[PDB]
Amino acid sequence: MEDPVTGPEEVSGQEQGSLTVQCRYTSGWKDYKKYWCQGVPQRSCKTLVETDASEQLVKKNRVSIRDNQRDFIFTVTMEDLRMSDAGIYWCGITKGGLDPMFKVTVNIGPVPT
Ligand code: NA
Numbered sequence: 001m002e003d004p005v006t007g008p009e010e011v012s013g014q015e016q017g018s019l020t021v022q023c024r025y026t027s028g029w030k031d032y033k034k035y036w037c038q039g040v041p042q043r044s045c046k047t048l049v050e051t052d053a054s055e056q057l058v059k060k061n062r063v064s065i066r067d068n069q070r071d072f073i074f075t076v077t078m079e080d081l082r083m084s085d086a087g088i089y090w091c092g093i094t095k096g097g098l099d100p101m102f103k104v105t106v107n108i109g110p111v112p113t
Pocket of ligand 1: 095
């Protein structure tokens, strides 16, 4: 579609597991830095990882991001999940002014015990 960035409405993972999020963007944003942001208010969110506008994998703490500039999707991976990882997150594209952003709600469930 024509929205600058879109993701899944929600994604779910299990404590000690991993989850992946596909953030799809329109072709014109190829050479922009892409990021994964956490919390609210939306435009004060905490950046967890951000690319350098290349396809090189970036990792900070337990979060990875890899931009596929052929299919125009950047994939976020969250590993070694904790219950406190649950909450509101954002796919984003960095630009001067208001970024394109898309809200993803992250659900975490515990190890069955
Ligand atoms: Na901005």
